[PDB]
Design a protein around this ligand. Structure first.
Ligand code: JBH
Ligand code: JBH
Lengths: 216, 213
């Protein structure tokens, strides 16, 4: 069984929910998802987890010490440590497929400004570390990215179950004066493929020219 | 006072949590977030929200009669209808900024295979509709994309609070045999900025060569 540990200062946000893809996976015994409050590894009265950046700049940086004790306790040398970060390598469908075979994912959730770089540098001496971004929009912390990563990876785990998709339709064949493309009604597996391919092309070149090796 | 309506078949999954950034925004009265179970608008005892695709093929497509009724009830002509879909335009930071000043976002969450296309086509005749993807990895449904969209947008609402960022550091100066780069403690702030410029250049070359052209 796969085991996923998430570490965060927002454990309630990351608490698994039964009616969800991860929830189904958990209840099917295919995965154990444990969530940990990073503040467990603080020792000061105020439970401080970050501090001002050396060299200045806006915002705060998470303290290396607290993350240190946390990952010390939760990780082994076989652990794949995932660290969401705006500055990471891209998280892709290829990445998802790869992590779907993993035995232990530990996901370190930190604020946008980052965890002290020495945390990941130190972890890499004992385990595999992957700093990744799920997109170039800006989230305030790694929490939502952790939820995205979990859903992308879990749906690939055995047992759990290029080009843009063109439009899709279902019943009724006429709705509010709008008709389904007749080829999709004609039952011709060949003509239908020709049409869907053509639609996908038009859509991809319009919305994602990058996918076909073009600019913008 | 932004309003966000989310429509989903996983309303518990999307329920706002007090201890989160969206929870802070709501508690601060800076936004109202309403989550609606899509099954409220189903027609049959089985509360059917999807149906098999015309032209055949795998998966299910979400029913237009059900979504049509939900959106009729929830949207107005001033609504910006957000439809997360892997087939969408990329959701970017410029998009988040734009949406950060909308009075009413409605986010329609559907399964990967998507919603009958007529739903969006119809809605676009009365309101602004944006189909967007948050990434090329595959999610089973738009629910997590919704959470992402919401967090990227809300953190740009006043009051809630080309190159990669380089490493950041804080105390202690020496930790487990690793020292904060001396230059950060130099009090030479022009130099620090050039140093961080160079850190960004290299990390970007190494991790995201796509942002260099
Ligand atoms: O992967 C990310 N994309 C955008 N913002 C982030 C903020 C914190 C962690 C991770 C991300
Ligand atoms: O933006 C998306 N990326 C990947 N999968 C999705 C599934 C449903 C809606 C949206 C997305």
């Amino acid at each position: 069984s796969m085991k996923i540990d998430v570490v965060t200062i927002f454990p309630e946000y990351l608490q698994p929910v039964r009616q969800s893809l991860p929830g189904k996976a958990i209840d099917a015994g295919l995965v154990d998802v444990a969530v940990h409050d990073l503040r467990r590894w603080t020792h000061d009265v105020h439970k401080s987890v970050d501090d001002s950046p050396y060299g200045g700049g806006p915002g705060m940086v998470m303290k290396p010490t607290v993350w240190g004790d946390a990952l010390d306790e939760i990780c082994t040398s076989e652990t794949l440590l995932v660290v969401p970060t705006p500055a990471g390598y891209p998280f892709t469908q290829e990445t998802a497929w790869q992590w779907s075979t993993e035995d232990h994912l530990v996901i370190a959730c930190g604020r946008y400004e980052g965890i002290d770089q020495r945390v990941a540098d130190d972890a890499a001496t004992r385990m595999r570390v992957r700093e990744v971004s799920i997109g170039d929009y800006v989230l305030n912390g790694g929490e939502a990215a952790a939820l995205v990563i979990i859903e992308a990876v879990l749906r690939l785990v055995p047992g759990v179950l290029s080009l843009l998709e063109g439009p899709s339709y279902t019943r009724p064949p006429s709705w509010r004066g709008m008709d389904v493309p007749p080829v999709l009604l004609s039952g011709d597996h060949a003509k239908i493929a020709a049409w869907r391919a053509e639609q996908s092309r038009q859509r991809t070149i319009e919305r994602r020219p990058d996918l076909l090796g073009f600019d913008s």
